[PDB]
């Protein structure tokens, strides 16, 4: 199934929603597009407008809140969108960062309608939408140089991993006696900017993290339990041909989808040894 020419400017993100039927894209044209794919057909449904700069990413929210989509852009802001009564409209706007926002992600539906945001300004913001609408977020300084990604850990006590341009990967946990997310662990292992970080939703004892970097390597970080440390495990002994840009875990099977710069997508799974191989 292919939807050629969804945009005329280069596209940076395409995400299907909770039912994996409703597509959504974003690119330099500074717009988002909603699609409806079936067998091998497709129908545009709208074009979201507002961002003053190329749009970097989008994330669909859990259906239990409505039909929402979040986006972030080089313009250093985040826009939420809604499809009420049959038409999309900018409900809220989040802009507390002073540089390009590169990632945005809806927390687990159990936490409510929270949003995880990371920016080149080095900070990360956590945002909920009050009873009235406005937003009173959490802002933390999380990386030097710039933050490129941030992902939520599955639900139990709330944790999320960030990936900065300081080559570091970082786990965060919420604390009461601070009313903020505090730095739980710093994981060193990349020699160049970390482009993305994905926390696997696998519900097994062991937790899985996958970080991708400008150094042409993918690292799977794992933690057996609370007393265990985060163990480093290169996805493969040899570096890759080009820069790895994204990492995505399936919802089941704990299968990793790696997006390279040689515009190639490799798939991996774990084996008896604890080493990865092509799935």
């Amino acid at each position: 199934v292919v939807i050629a020419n969804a945009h005329n400017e280069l596209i940076h993100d395409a995400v299907l929603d909770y039912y994996g039927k409703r597509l959504a894209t974003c690119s330099s044209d500074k717009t988002i597009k909603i699609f409806e794919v079936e067998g091998e057909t497709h129908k545009l449904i709208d074009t979201l407008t507002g961002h003053e700069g190329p749009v970097w990413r989008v994330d669909w929210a859990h259906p239990k809140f409505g039909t929402i989509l979040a986006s972030c852009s080089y313009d250093g802001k985040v826009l939420i969108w809604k499809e009420e009564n049959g038409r999309w409209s900018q409900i809220a706007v989040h802009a507390v960062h002073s540089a390009s926002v590169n990632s945005v992600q809806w927390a687990p539906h159990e936490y409510g309608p929270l949003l995880l945001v990371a920016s080149s300004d080095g900070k990360v913001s956590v945002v909920e939408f009050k009873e009235n609408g406005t937003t009173s977020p959490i802002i933390i300084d999380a990386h030097a140089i710039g933050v490129n990604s941030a992902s939520w850990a599955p639900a139990t006590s709330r944790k999320f991993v960030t990936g900065g341009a300081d080559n570091l990967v970082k786990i965060w946990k919420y604390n009461s006696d601070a009313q903020t997310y505090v730095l739980e662990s710093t994981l060193e292992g990349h020699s160049d900017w970390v482009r993305d970080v994905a926390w696997s939703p696998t519900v097994l004892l062991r937790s899985y993290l996958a970080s991708v970097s400008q150094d042409r390597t993918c690292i799977i970080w794992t933690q057996d339990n609370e007393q265990g440390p985060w163990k480093k495990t290169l996805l493969k002994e040899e570096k890759f041909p080009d820069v790895l840009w994204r990492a995505s875990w399936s919802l089941s099977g704990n299968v990793l989808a790696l997006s390279g710069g040689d515009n190639k997508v490799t798939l991996w799974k774990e084996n008896l040894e604890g080493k990865w191989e092509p799935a």
Partner: protein, 340 residues
């Protein structure tokens, strides 16, 4: 702004990525070696012919016990439920001519004899019992119609024998139209008997027939007769008991699989599948959801199925779950939109 597939996974096991031209989106369902939609199950669940499915599990069974269950199901497949419970619950001087003189010797004899002739059949027995002339007491009674008398002796026989003879204790029960005694103390080895004493005493009262059959199954399974307790359950129509046994046997089963060179996932995956196919085929021959863990694990197989893209087989199991459970509710809705 650099170019990149920006790949993502989505429900149904779909992979979304960006074309190299950087202007197109491509959704697909990658082939994950090891993961395959369950056709056999979908096709057998519709054509209700688990011959192939059963033949599959049988030919690739795991431990010895597991083999019995599938065999139990392999034969239950051909012979049918009724015919099965049959082959499974069945089993492998007059005259005297008097001669010569004789005489009433003793007071006892004389007293009883006089009673008789004097048409006093009642006293004869009293005088008999109050002596160890039970054999006789019984003979006289085996001639009258008077029930209370025709019974005052039985209760007299048992009174001093039902404890020195197993057959005596059994008679005591057959006599007094009961099974409680056998069902609870007769050696489990002779169960196919306590089995016939239930179908015999309660031939027109099914609720009781099955309450007893159950009471026995529990005893068998709890005293080394696993395979047999299942047979009794299969006849009492208590899928719940068979389910409970199988849910407790689950762990150890997933462990024997994990030691068989399989990743935590291959084991967990394979296990839940075998259990679900084993439970489905079994629930298809008995007379039978309200068990939490079973539900819990039912939901689990749903997700593994949706991830295969086989939304149809997923809905089938969705239906069988109580539309009273929210998780069941939510997934029911999700699977709908995802497929519809």
């Amino acid at each position: 702004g650099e170019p990149s597939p920006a790949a993502h996974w989505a429900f149904g096991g779909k992979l979304v990525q960006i074309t190299p031209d950087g202007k197109g989106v491509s959704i697909t369902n990658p082939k994950i070696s090891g993961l395959e939609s369950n056709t056999t199950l979908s096709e057998a669940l519709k054509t209700k012919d688990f011959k192939p499915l059963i033949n599959q599990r049988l030919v690739k069974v795991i431990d010895d016990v597991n083999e019995e269950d599938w065999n139990l199901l392999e034969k239950l497949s051909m012979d049918g439920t009724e015919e099965f419970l049959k082959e499974a619950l069945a089993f492998d001087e007059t005259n005297f001519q008097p001669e010569g003189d004789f005489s009433l010797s003793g007071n006892i004899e004389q007293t009883i004899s006089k009673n008789l002739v004097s048409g006093n059949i009642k006293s004869a027995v009293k005088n008999s019992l109050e002596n160890d002339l039970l054999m006789e007491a019984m003979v006289i009674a085996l001639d009258s119609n008077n029930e209370r008398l025709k019974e005052s002796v039985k209760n007299a026989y048992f009174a001093k024998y039902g404890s020195k003879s197993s057959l005596s204790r059994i008679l005591y029960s057959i006599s007094k139209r009961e099974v409680d005694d056998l069902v609870e103390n007769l050696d489990v080895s002779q169960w196919k008997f306590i089995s016939k004493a239930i179908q015999n005493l309660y031939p027109n009262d099914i609720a009781q027939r099955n309450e007893m059959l159950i009471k026995l199954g529990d005893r068998l399974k709890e005293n080394g007769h696993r395979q047999d307790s299942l047979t009794l359950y299969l006849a009492a129509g208590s899928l719940d008991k068979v389910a409970s046994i199988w849910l407790s046997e689950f762990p150890d089963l997933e462990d024997k699989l994990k030691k068989d060179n399989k990743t935590i996932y291959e084991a967990h995956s394979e296990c839940l599948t075998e259990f679900i196919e084993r439970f489905t085929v079994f629930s298809n021959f008995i007379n039978g959801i309200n068990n939490e863990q079973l539900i819990a694990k039912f939901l689990e197989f749903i997700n593994l199925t949706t991830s295969t893209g086989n939304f149809e087989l997923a809905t089938e199991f969705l239906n069988s779950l109580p539309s009273d459970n929210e998780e069941v509710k939510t997934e029911k809705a999700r699977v709908l939109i995802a497929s519809g």
